[PDB]
Amino acid sequence: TLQDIGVSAGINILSAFVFFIIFAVLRLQPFNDRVYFSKWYLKGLRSSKFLNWMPEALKMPEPELIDHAGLDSVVYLRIYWLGLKIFTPIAVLAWAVLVPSMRFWTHIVMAYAFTIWTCYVLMKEYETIANMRLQFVASEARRPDQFTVLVRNVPPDADESVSELVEHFFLVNHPDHYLTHQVVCNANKLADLVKKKKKLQNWLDYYQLKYARNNSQRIMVKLGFLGLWGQKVDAIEHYIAEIDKISKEISKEREEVVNDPKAIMPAAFVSFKTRWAAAVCAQTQQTRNPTQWLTEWAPEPRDVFWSNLAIPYVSLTVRRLIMHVAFFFLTFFFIVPIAFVQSLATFMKSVIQGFLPGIALKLFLAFLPSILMIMSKFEGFTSISSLERRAAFRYYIFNLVNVFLASVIAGAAFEQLPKTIGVAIPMKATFFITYIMVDGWAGVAGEILMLKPLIMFHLKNAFLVKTDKDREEAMDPGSIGFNTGEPRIQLYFLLGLVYAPVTPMLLPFILVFFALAYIVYRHQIINVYNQEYESAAAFWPDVHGRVIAALVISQLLLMGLLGTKHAALAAPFLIALPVLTIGFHHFCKGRYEPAFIRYPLQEAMMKDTLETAREPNLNLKGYLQNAYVHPVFK
Amino acid sequence: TLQDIGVSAGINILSAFVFFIIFAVLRLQPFNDRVYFSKWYLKGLRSSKFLNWMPEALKMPEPELIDHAGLDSVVYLRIYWLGLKIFTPIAVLAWAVLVPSMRFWTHIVMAYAFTIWTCYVLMKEYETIANMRLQFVASEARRPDQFTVLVRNVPPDADESVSELVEHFFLVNHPDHYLTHQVVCNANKLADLVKKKKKLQNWLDYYQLKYARNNSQRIMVKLGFLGLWGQKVDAIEHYIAEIDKISKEISKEREEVVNDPKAIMPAAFVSFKTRWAAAVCAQTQQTRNPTQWLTEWAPEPRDVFWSNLAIPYVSLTVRRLIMHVAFFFLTFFFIVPIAFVQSLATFMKSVIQGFLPGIALKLFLAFLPSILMIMSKFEGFTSISSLERRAAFRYYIFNLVNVFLASVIAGAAFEQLPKTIGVAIPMKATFFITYIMVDGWAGVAGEILMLKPLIMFHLKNAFLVKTDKDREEAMDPGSIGFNTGEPRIQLYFLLGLVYAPVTPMLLPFILVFFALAYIVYRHQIINVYNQEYESAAAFWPDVHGRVIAALVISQLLLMGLLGTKHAALAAPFLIALPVLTIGFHHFCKGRYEPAFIRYPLQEAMMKDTLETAREPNLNLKGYLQNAYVHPVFK
């Protein structure tokens, strides 16, 4: 159905060009400048032939982009370049070799070439990223997180307070380096009350502007049809009433939370004097139990997920298991719409009908990053970076289990209307081309439109904004979105690697997606997407591990697939290559991953010496003790 | 062939009782007191109804035995108690249940009981051993190894010496804690010359005593028949001649080795002031490369294998791979005598012929611990403890691959004169009972005889000893022999676990071996077996891992075996139990193994504080700098 694929591709590229044209015409509008150029505002640099933004994105080379946006953004961007570097020679060599038992050994040696090239590119990129992280960490400005270690699960005491326990323990075991400490408070109730107050005040301003527009009183209890059994006829005095009562509530909650000993949760942020001391404390076991006096690198003040610091350490494992069970239920139940989509993958009616499954499946996977974020937040991780990484890992597992495996299994089952997977895989190339089309080129073209925050900005200005100076807060496009971004390229890696040595017709589409997404996300990191959390590109070990796992999966699927030719005898090679790949991954880990997982003491001391030399009048105690308190207690 | 088994057992127990009687009669001899009671001499406590040594061994409880012999010896002894604790309820329950598809589920639940009980006993013992190690480390006397860290693979410099590099680096990165350093020298040639001189002087004393006994001149060149093409008619002036020439050789070698810069190998022993500082340095990455400035806990001065400190770090991986290949060749080639023994496992001729395979196989496995020690020494490990542990691991791999697996495979092949392993395994119970008999009860009974060092002592006294005060050096029975000891119990664990849920007739023999070896080795640790190296029972993680692996092997073999009943449908349980065992092993690791692999800073500082309080006048620099030089340079 190459003609059907061509029709779908033409429709999608036309849609992408229309998206680009609409983006261009909106970009020239003076009143949506703050949404299409949200950065330079949070950075404070701006105030207020037709597709030149594409070549514009290619300026401002890597160091300037780093210091402009963040090493996290730059490395996540380089993921796309990694994809291109891997798959361009795959595309050329595989396409030329398979498209105009000798072909058997041809496939075998071809797969060896695939794996060797992928491993080499991964190794080179991994080394480069390690160098970039080390240099950036050495050159980073002073942050309170480089001095502070997070102490968890402090053992209880009968008559001794947590703060005194922490101070005494660290004064005994880290003399002439311990500076101060801060104990975490269980202020979840007060934070929730503050959020509720903010929402109620927003509603009050909404109805005040509604009254200004038209003098009328509305008696709907927050839903109109099946809301609360009341009226609140004017609702303005109503909102004034409960905002006042919750103001009294918040004042009270402050009164007891500032002095309730039961709110002192057994964990504390401990800050030392020198990054060397922090590195010493954060990399060594502290006491008898490996379950007491745990030490971890304390995240940035703007990074720490204050909500999850209240979970006692005893329940972390129970939450681990319950969320694993919930993930199992989700991925098992979610075969139903996958089956629906694959059935939809059953002339202007047939071609568009074959186009439909991509749209249907992508729509069914719209809210999933949010769902995964919610379950990971239910789990305790305490830092936005770790939350995003864990969500990305769970999302990649979901994609591998369902979007690929369940798709091919349901396709085989519907084709049949005991393992024929080797023949069932290849003719799903058409469905996978349709899906790569839609969730690739169309998805990115829609992404550049910034439609959701654009509509949010217009609606907020038109209905909710009552005073000025609030538009800067109104615009906040969020981070790059690692959790929703990188598992998609992981999935596309999987498709390319799996289908390359069997059906080479897939690869060019992935190449086009890589190029287009690279340019688009480069422009987006340049002009929008303020970063919430500043990691030092710490997710790269996870990315490299995922790529290795995808490579092993591709190799095993090839081994299974080549069983169609009777007595294949390819086992003594297709069982020897995957163990070689695992060994290479082990070597790459042991050779470079320490630069990501451990902090060298020599660099800690060198940075500290440079800092002391250049800033001999640093009030480090005053700088450190006042941070890590709480957002509400500020 | 239960009668044949009984005849073999009776013969072996009679042999064991004869061994015990001969041991008893020799133990009363005043002139072999130094060999049957070698300890109390290296410890300095002795000088110079019929089986009461068995109850005598049971006195002197665990703390006194610890401080008498060593925690390594006590823990290795407790391995036998671990075996008994695991396998006694296995014996009772399995024997009563299987000996007077319901039996199918009976087997399934029986295996679950087996695994659960074994895991529980392993967990309890693992906790107890962790507590013992922690308390003993906290209570140990002062040793130079607790202050010193071994720095390997120092990067080369153009015009800067290794000693100055080490001193400068540590004065920059560990201020107010670095005390002194010692660089390792490449004195292998000089040590070899000293050993050659010792051997030649021994030969000279031999021939001097021979001349004293009988005035004659012997013209054999060290072999008589096909030796060197010479005479050395008297050989006494001959030996004087070359001992003099090699004395000049050794003097010269000292002259150039003391001042040759090329002998300064890039590694150094660095000693700090406080055990806290040593723990900080020995547990953290030091610099950019994870392949430079490596830090490891420096072994004891009497432990360090000075020969292997001369291997440059670049060739360690090459040696790893070449020795893995050599191990593969050894284990693959060594099927030949295993096939011979299994063929020997084909009435006083038939019964003794069926007894023969145990003797033949045990004899063929006599020199193997020595061979494995030689190959591990060819590998670079630098410490006797690590050498013994690595040799034990390789020996356990050998046993699993050959003595069990190749035995059953060759037995199936010879019975046939495509996987019938499930039926081939059980009737090898007779061969395994014969082998457990021989290399168990007979082996231990022979072990108590101390025959080899006894004969060595008599021969040395009669032929080599020329003066007195050398008998104390003449007696040296060596360590407990962890490398040759513990993989044997590992193999017996494997047999018991594998054969218990299929053929319960094996277990009582293993129980008897456990009891007898426990008593015998307890007596031997009490009275003989000085310890070469004082580890803090650091091999227990290895032992526990080996037991877990054996348990998984038993479970998988059961799963394969139960396939004889058509459509067994036991997979949804026998694939779920092994993953549960792996998960339990992971939990046990993460919960206790840190006490063995990492040194808590709190304990380091507590020990240091106690030491400073009790000994305020410690010349630590003088104590530390003079150690770790070399045995020859003393």
Side-chain angles (χ1 to χ4, degrees), chain A residues 1-212 224 227 230 233-634, chain B residues 1-212 224 227 230 233-634:
Chain A
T1 66
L2 63 94
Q3 287 80 5
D4 293 331
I5 301 299
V7 171
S8 179
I11 287 167
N12 190 9
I13 62 170
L14 287 171
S15 180
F17 264 79
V18 179
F19 284 2
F20 287 137
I21 287 291
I22 294 169
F23 159 65
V25 66
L26 291 153
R27 190 159 84 113
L28 303 176
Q29 300 300 289
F31 63 93
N32 73 346
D33 63 358
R34 199 182 316 296
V35 65
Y36 280 173
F37 293 93
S38 49
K39 278 193 83 71
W40 323 95
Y41 281 117
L42 301 166
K43 199 171 177 65
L45 273 70
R46 288 175 77 254
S47 190
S48 176
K49 293 64 161 153
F50 314 130
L51 294 174
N52 54 337
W53 58 272
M54 271 194 189
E56 275 273 10
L58 267 298
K59 274 76 176 175
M60 182 179 72
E62 297 256 350
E64 189 147 30
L65 182 56
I66 281 178
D67 294 335
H68 178 77
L71 187 54
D72 291 331
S73 302
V74 166
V75 162
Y76 167 74
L77 181 153
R78 274 188 67 93
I79 297 181
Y80 288 154
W81 196 264
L82 166 71
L84 270 188
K85 286 192 293 184
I86 297 170
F87 269 68
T88 300
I90 292 141
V92 160
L93 183 63
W95 184 258
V97 160
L98 277 296
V99 173
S101 69
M102 295 299 291
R103 74 280 191 190
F104 182 76
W105 297 129
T106 300
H107 273 217
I108 302 299
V109 67
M110 187 66 204
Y112 279 100
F114 276 109
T115 287
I116 296 169
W117 175 256
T118 303
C119 287
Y120 172 77
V121 176
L122 287 180
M123 191 185 68
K124 203 67 46 163
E125 188 74 15
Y126 199 78
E127 181 167 301
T128 298
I129 290 303
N131 278 341
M132 261 195 288
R133 170 184 218 269
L134 286 178
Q135 197 270 329
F136 171 72
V137 160
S139 66
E140 197 173 16
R142 175 167 61 253
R143 294 176 333 182
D145 67 347
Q146 313 164 270
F147 295 72
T148 300
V149 67
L150 170 73
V151 172
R152 319 214 50 183
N153 204 22
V154 165
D157 190 283
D159 60 355
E160 190 69 25
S161 73
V162 175
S163 177
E164 286 147 322
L165 268 169
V166 162
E167 192 181 45
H168 177 65
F169 175 85
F170 276 106
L171 270 182
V172 175
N173 293 7
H174 289 262
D176 182 5
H177 286 306
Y178 160 68
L179 177 61
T180 183
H181 76 295
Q182 207 64 27
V183 294
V184 64
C185 303
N186 186 11
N188 296 295
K189 308 161 52 94
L190 188 153
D192 183 339
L193 287 190
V194 169
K195 284 202 321 313
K196 190 44 164 295
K197 179 176 181 291
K198 218 162 263 193
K199 183 60 67 179
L200 292 175
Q201 188 274 331
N202 287 332
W203 269 120
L204 181 142
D205 279 8
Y206 181 76
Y207 283 140
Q208 277 169 337
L209 188 153
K210 185 263 184 181
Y211 213 80
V233 175
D234 202 67
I236 286 168
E237 69 277 15
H238 186 273
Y239 291 170
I240 293 171
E242 79 265 55
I243 177 169
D244 291 331
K245 79 178 184 67
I246 62 170
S247 173
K248 293 184 288 294
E249 212 165 10
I250 285 173
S251 56
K252 180 68 173 67
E253 289 291 328
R254 284 211 161 121
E255 313 309 327
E256 69 274 15
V257 164
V258 66
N259 57 2
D260 189 0
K262 277 74 69 177
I264 294 298
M265 191 85 67
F269 290 90
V270 187
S271 301
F272 297 91
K273 281 178 176 177
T274 62
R275 296 171 190 75
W276 183 85
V280 163
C281 176
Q283 295 174 67
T284 48
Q285 190 146 348
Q286 273 296 313
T287 186
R288 285 316 199 70
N289 292 315
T291 56
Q292 287 181 335
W293 297 100
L294 276 156
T295 51
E296 294 169 352
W297 274 108
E300 286 193 8
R302 66 165 139 93
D303 195 349
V304 172
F305 200 64
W306 303 96
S307 298
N308 264 283
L309 285 174
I311 280 178
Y313 204 99
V314 63
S315 71
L316 270 294
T317 59
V318 172
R319 282 172 173 265
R320 290 278 193 274
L321 266 294
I322 193 66
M323 291 315 327
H324 270 267
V325 173
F327 180 50
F328 171 52
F329 291 167
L330 174 63
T331 183
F332 185 79
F333 281 178
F334 205 78
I335 191 167
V336 176
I338 296 160
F340 173 74
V341 162
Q342 183 62 255
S343 179
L344 287 179
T346 180
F347 59 93
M348 202 37 50
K349 200 162 170 133
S350 63
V351 298
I352 308 314
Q353 182 60 229
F355 181 76
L356 275 172
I359 301 299
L361 191 146
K362 179 174 177 288
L363 198 167
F364 273 120
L365 294 178
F367 293 100
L368 184 60
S370 292
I371 299 315
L372 288 164
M373 181 56 28
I374 299 299
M375 42 195 307
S376 173
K377 276 182 177 180
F378 174 93
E379 181 66 299
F381 273 120
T382 62
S383 62
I384 295 175
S385 169
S386 161
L387 288 175
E388 285 197 353
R389 287 169 70 195
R390 195 50 169 218
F393 161 72
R394 291 194 194 285
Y395 185 47
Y396 158 65
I397 301 299
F398 174 70
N399 296 115
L400 194 169
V401 161
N402 286 120
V403 171
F404 161 79
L405 183 63
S407 286
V408 67
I409 292 315
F414 291 166
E415 272 196 359
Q416 290 169 339
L417 298 171
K419 295 180 181 180
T420 58
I421 53 178
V423 298
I425 277 164
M427 72 290 291
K428 284 332 201 163
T430 184
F431 155 71
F432 269 130
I433 289 170
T434 57
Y435 174 67
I436 193 66
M437 211 46 88
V438 176
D439 191 68
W441 316 348
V444 175
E447 183 50 286
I448 193 66
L449 281 193
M450 211 55 58
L451 182 62
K452 314 262 191 263
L454 173 63
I455 298 313
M456 200 215 73
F457 193 85
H458 295 285
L459 294 174
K460 278 187 175 182
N461 271 352
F463 293 62
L464 182 44
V465 165
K466 202 101 182 182
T467 182
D468 206 1
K469 306 299 182 282
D470 59 354
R471 295 178 184 172
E472 306 294 309
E473 293 83 3
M475 186 65 204
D476 186 74
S479 310
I480 180 57
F482 173 84
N483 63 6
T484 186
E486 73 89 19
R488 196 186 38 189
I489 186 171
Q490 284 302 322
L491 167 72
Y492 294 6
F493 273 29
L494 194 61
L495 281 71
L497 263 178
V498 163
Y499 265 86
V502 54
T503 292
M505 293 177 71
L506 178 65
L507 296 170
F509 305 97
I510 295 171
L511 294 174
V512 176
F513 160 81
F514 281 162
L516 182 58
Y518 186 96
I519 300 187
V520 161
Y521 281 176
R522 198 178 168 75
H523 169 269
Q524 301 266 37
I525 294 170
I526 286 166
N527 287 325
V528 305
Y529 290 161
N530 184 2
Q531 263 174 269
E532 278 164 345
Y533 61 101
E534 179 64 281
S535 175
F539 47 81
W540 190 259
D542 302 328
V543 176
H544 166 80
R546 293 201 253 285
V547 179
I548 297 298
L551 185 64
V552 176
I553 293 302
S554 170
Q555 284 192 181
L556 287 186
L557 273 295
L558 171 70
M559 171 283 268
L561 195 166
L562 294 174
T564 65
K565 182 176 184 291
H566 191 281
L569 294 174
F573 294 130
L574 276 296
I575 195 66
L577 183 61
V579 301
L580 188 151
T581 300
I582 298 282
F584 155 82
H585 154 67
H586 180 27
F587 157 76
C588 182
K589 177 176 203 231
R591 172 63 190 78
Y592 299 101
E593 191 275 5
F596 293 93
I597 202 77
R598 296 159 101 187
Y599 198 52
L601 299 191
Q602 182 187 41
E603 296 264 348
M605 191 65 158
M606 201 175 58
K607 197 183 180 313
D608 285 358
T609 304
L610 289 199
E611 175 163 64
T612 300
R614 292 187 315 99
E615 281 104 309
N617 303 285
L618 205 43
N619 190 5
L620 202 43
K621 193 168 158 24
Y623 181 40
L624 286 171
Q625 64 163 358
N626 275 26
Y628 287 150
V629 174
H630 202 276
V632 303
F633 285 130
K634 190 173 264 151
Chain B
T1 65
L2 63 95
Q3 287 80 5
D4 293 331
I5 301 299
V7 171
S8 179
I11 287 167
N12 190 9
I13 62 170
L14 287 171
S15 180
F17 264 79
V18 179
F19 284 2
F20 287 137
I21 287 291
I22 294 169
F23 159 65
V25 66
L26 291 153
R27 190 159 84 113
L28 303 176
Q29 300 300 289
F31 64 93
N32 73 346
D33 63 358
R34 199 182 316 296
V35 65
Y36 280 173
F37 293 93
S38 49
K39 278 193 83 71
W40 323 95
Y41 281 117
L42 301 166
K43 199 171 177 65
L45 273 70
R46 288 175 77 254
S47 190
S48 175
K49 293 64 161 153
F50 314 130
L51 294 174
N52 54 337
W53 58 272
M54 271 194 189
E56 275 273 10
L58 267 298
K59 274 76 176 175
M60 182 179 72
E62 297 256 350
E64 189 147 30
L65 182 57
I66 281 178
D67 294 335
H68 178 77
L71 187 54
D72 291 331
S73 302
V74 166
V75 162
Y76 167 74
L77 181 153
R78 274 188 67 93
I79 297 181
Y80 288 154
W81 196 263
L82 166 71
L84 270 188
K85 286 192 293 184
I86 296 170
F87 269 68
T88 300
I90 292 141
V92 160
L93 183 63
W95 184 258
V97 160
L98 277 296
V99 173
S101 69
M102 294 299 291
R103 74 280 191 190
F104 182 76
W105 297 129
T106 300
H107 272 216
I108 301 299
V109 67
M110 187 66 204
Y112 279 100
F114 276 109
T115 287
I116 296 169
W117 175 256
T118 303
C119 287
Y120 172 77
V121 176
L122 287 180
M123 191 185 68
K124 203 67 46 163
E125 188 74 15
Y126 199 78
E127 181 167 301
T128 298
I129 290 303
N131 278 341
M132 261 195 288
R133 170 184 218 269
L134 286 178
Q135 197 270 329
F136 171 72
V137 160
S139 66
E140 197 173 16
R142 175 167 61 253
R143 294 176 333 182
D145 67 347
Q146 313 164 270
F147 295 71
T148 300
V149 67
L150 170 73
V151 172
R152 319 214 50 183
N153 204 22
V154 165
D157 190 283
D159 59 355
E160 190 69 25
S161 73
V162 175
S163 177
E164 286 147 322
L165 268 169
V166 162
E167 192 181 45
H168 177 65
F169 175 85
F170 276 106
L171 270 182
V172 176
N173 293 7
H174 289 262
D176 182 5
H177 286 306
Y178 160 68
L179 177 61
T180 183
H181 76 295
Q182 207 64 27
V183 294
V184 64
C185 304
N186 186 11
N188 296 295
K189 308 161 52 94
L190 188 153
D192 182 339
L193 287 190
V194 169
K195 284 202 321 313
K196 190 44 164 295
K197 179 176 181 291
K198 218 162 263 193
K199 183 60 67 179
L200 292 175
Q201 188 274 331
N202 287 332
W203 269 120
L204 181 142
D205 279 8
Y206 181 76
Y207 283 140
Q208 277 169 337
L209 188 153
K210 185 263 184 181
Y211 213 80
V233 175
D234 202 67
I236 286 168
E237 69 277 15
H238 186 273
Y239 291 170
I240 293 171
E242 79 265 55
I243 177 169
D244 291 331
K245 79 178 184 67
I246 62 170
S247 173
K248 293 184 288 294
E249 212 165 10
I250 285 173
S251 56
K252 180 68 173 67
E253 289 291 328
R254 284 211 161 121
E255 313 309 327
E256 69 274 15
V257 164
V258 66
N259 57 2
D260 189 0
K262 277 73 69 177
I264 294 298
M265 191 85 67
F269 290 90
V270 187
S271 301
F272 297 91
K273 281 178 176 177
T274 62
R275 296 172 190 75
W276 183 85
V280 163
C281 176
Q283 296 174 67
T284 48
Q285 190 146 348
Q286 273 296 313
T287 186
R288 285 316 199 70
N289 292 316
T291 56
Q292 287 181 335
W293 297 100
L294 276 156
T295 51
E296 294 169 352
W297 274 108
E300 286 193 8
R302 66 166 139 93
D303 195 349
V304 172
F305 200 64
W306 303 96
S307 298
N308 264 283
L309 285 174
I311 280 178
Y313 204 99
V314 63
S315 71
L316 270 294
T317 59
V318 172
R319 282 172 173 265
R320 290 278 193 274
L321 266 294
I322 193 66
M323 291 315 327
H324 270 267
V325 173
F327 180 50
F328 171 52
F329 291 167
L330 174 63
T331 183
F332 185 79
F333 281 178
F334 205 78
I335 191 167
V336 176
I338 296 160
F340 173 74
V341 162
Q342 183 62 255
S343 179
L344 288 179
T346 180
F347 59 94
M348 202 37 50
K349 200 162 170 133
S350 63
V351 298
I352 308 314
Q353 182 60 229
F355 181 76
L356 275 172
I359 301 299
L361 191 146
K362 178 174 177 288
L363 198 167
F364 273 120
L365 294 178
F367 294 100
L368 184 60
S370 292
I371 299 315
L372 288 164
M373 181 56 28
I374 299 299
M375 42 195 307
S376 173
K377 276 182 177 180
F378 174 93
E379 181 66 299
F381 273 120
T382 62
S383 62
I384 295 175
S385 169
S386 161
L387 288 175
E388 285 197 353
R389 287 169 70 195
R390 195 50 169 218
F393 161 72
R394 291 194 194 285
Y395 185 47
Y396 158 65
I397 301 299
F398 174 70
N399 296 115
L400 194 169
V401 161
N402 286 120
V403 171
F404 161 79
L405 183 63
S407 287
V408 67
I409 292 315
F414 291 166
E415 272 196 359
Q416 290 169 339
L417 298 171
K419 295 180 181 180
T420 58
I421 53 178
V423 298
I425 277 164
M427 73 290 291
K428 284 332 201 163
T430 184
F431 155 71
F432 269 130
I433 289 170
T434 57
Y435 174 67
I436 193 66
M437 211 46 88
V438 176
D439 191 68
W441 316 348
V444 175
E447 183 50 286
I448 193 66
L449 281 193
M450 211 55 58
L451 182 62
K452 314 262 191 263
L454 173 63
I455 298 313
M456 200 215 74
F457 193 85
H458 295 285
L459 294 174
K460 279 187 175 182
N461 271 352
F463 293 62
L464 182 44
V465 165
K466 202 101 182 182
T467 182
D468 206 1
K469 306 299 182 282
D470 59 354
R471 295 178 184 172
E472 306 294 309
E473 293 82 3
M475 186 66 204
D476 186 74
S479 310
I480 180 57
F482 172 84
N483 63 6
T484 186
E486 73 89 19
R488 196 186 38 189
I489 186 170
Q490 284 302 322
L491 167 72
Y492 294 6
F493 273 29
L494 193 61
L495 281 71
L497 263 178
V498 163
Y499 265 86
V502 54
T503 292
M505 293 177 71
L506 178 66
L507 296 170
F509 305 97
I510 295 171
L511 294 174
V512 176
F513 160 81
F514 281 162
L516 182 58
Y518 186 96
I519 300 187
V520 161
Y521 281 176
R522 198 178 168 75
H523 169 269
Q524 301 266 37
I525 294 170
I526 286 166
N527 287 325
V528 305
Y529 290 161
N530 183 2
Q531 263 174 270
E532 278 164 345
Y533 61 101
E534 179 64 281
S535 175
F539 47 81
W540 190 259
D542 302 328
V543 176
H544 166 80
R546 293 201 253 285
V547 179
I548 297 298
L551 185 64
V552 176
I553 294 302
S554 170
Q555 284 192 181
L556 287 186
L557 273 295
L558 171 70
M559 171 283 267
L561 195 166
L562 294 174
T564 65
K565 182 176 184 291
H566 191 281
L569 294 174
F573 294 130
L574 276 296
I575 195 66
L577 183 61
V579 301
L580 188 151
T581 300
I582 298 282
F584 155 82
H585 154 67
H586 180 27
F587 157 76
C588 182
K589 178 176 203 231
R591 172 63 190 78
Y592 299 101
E593 191 275 5
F596 293 93
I597 202 77
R598 296 159 101 187
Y599 198 52
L601 299 191
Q602 182 187 41
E603 296 264 348
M605 191 65 158
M606 201 175 58
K607 197 183 180 313
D608 285 358
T609 304
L610 289 199
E611 175 163 64
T612 300
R614 292 187 315 99
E615 281 104 309
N617 303 285
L618 205 43
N619 190 5
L620 202 43
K621 193 168 158 24
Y623 181 40
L624 286 171
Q625 64 163 358
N626 275 26
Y628 287 150
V629 174
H630 202 276
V632 303
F633 285 130
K634 190 173 264 151

